[PDB]
Design a protein around this ligand. Sequence first.
Ligand code: 5MY
Ligand code: ANP
Ligand code: MG
Ligand code: ZN
Length: 414
Amino acid sequence: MILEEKDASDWIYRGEGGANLVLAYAGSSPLFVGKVIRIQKARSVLTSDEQHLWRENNELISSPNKEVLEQRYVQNVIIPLLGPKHVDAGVRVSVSKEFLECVDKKVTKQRPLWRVNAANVDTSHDSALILNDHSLFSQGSGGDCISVEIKPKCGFLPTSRFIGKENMLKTSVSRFKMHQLLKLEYIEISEESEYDPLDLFSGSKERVLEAIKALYSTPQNNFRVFLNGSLILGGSGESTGRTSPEIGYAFEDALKGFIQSEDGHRTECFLQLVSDAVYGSGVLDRLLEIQKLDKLDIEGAIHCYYDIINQPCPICKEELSLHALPLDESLKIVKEYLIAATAKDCSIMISFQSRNAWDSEPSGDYVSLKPTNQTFDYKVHFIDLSLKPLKRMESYYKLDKKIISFYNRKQKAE
Ligand SMILES: O=P(O)(O)O[C@@H]1[C@@H](OP(=O)(O)O)[C@H](OP(=O)(O)O)[C@H](O)[C@H](OP(=O)(O)O)[C@H]1OP(=O)(O)O
Ligand SMILES: Nc1ncnc2c1ncn2[C@@H]1O[C@H](COP(=O)(O)OP(=O)(O)NP(=O)(O)O)[C@@H](O)[C@H]1O
Ligand SMILES: [Mg+2]
Ligand SMILES: [Zn+2]
């Protein structure tokens, strides 16, 4: 029930995002075998404005800590929306300060330096999240498991009435593609990614495959691959650089026996396998619907935000429409905007294993690889379904203004 100091040595770095540190269990305890632990970082549990926003979900507003908050957020808001088939809310577990402290230290050296600069484990939370490890095909075997993680980002184009005259490029150019230019400018990446989210979410099989090949070539922080829980393609707690021949070889070699093709051809077969799973599964259509809860764009939603927090709108100057909405409706719009923001920033994990004829109940989800003559069963889970803080509406607006006005400036340079 409680993780103490010495338990710390049975957990090993798995990765991290901007919000949580994730460790995988390497011990023997039947309690943790096949799990990861997800620990919130530090960069009362809900502002007053937030309790207003989440009023409809009381069990949410009365969450005693942040861990229970996320847990109930996923169970009560996200589940109802994506079904429970592809989602795990997690089980909370007591951790002690010294355990947390001990984990922080143990993994420090395996973290990107910049991640360590930005934040650490909040060693004041008394709880943490335990999740099923989706790099493991099933909880509690059918041989090896190749697991693929995709952070798809936003797969549609805003079409809002509320997009400003100087910003209409947002109407035709993906946010992900415009953001890439800024990141390069800010030395957050070394080269622009080849991935286009519009391809991946297109519903076109050839365009999904194109997205997958692109993710493979330039994974940044959008693509990872695991062999039985150990990373073989992608970044460790951060964006990785373009796939090089050295990385190409290492990954090709890691696939041996799993993709049963000739040496050198495994990679192409694996890419097709992922594509077939994504596409055939239809899992992205559902995610995309949630993303489209951002109905009005940040340029529209921001106006409702100031109404919700009762501040005169600094964006309007000396939109009669949005400002004439009843409070109830402004709340809805912003809540949906923040649900959409969860959807836009989560990941999909797709676990693969050789079709097991001895399954006592044969799986309905699988993929037959043309060439190899193999069948793989697969499973999809969504991960990283974090609650986004309402206050963040302000920076969403500024980051957006920054993205588009830099993209415009870059284009003007014809
Ligand atoms: O705003 P975006 O689209 O850049 O997304 C942020 C991510 O950057 P990305 O562009 O995905 O590399 C960002 O990822 P990195 O920290 O850059 O790996 C986080 O996921 C961030 O969420 P949070 O602060 O952890 O709640 C994300 O912020 P939210 O927009 O989800 O609040
Ligand atoms: N249930 C899980 N099973 C397997 N791997 C996981 C699981 N949850 C997280 N991970 C891995 O650990 C990494 C960090 O988890 P994540 O929940 O995305 O952290 P985060 O800081 O909340 N991400 P973000 O806020 O979107 O930047 C993920 O990219 C996965 O590789
Ligand atoms: Mg998160
Ligand atoms: Zn306004």
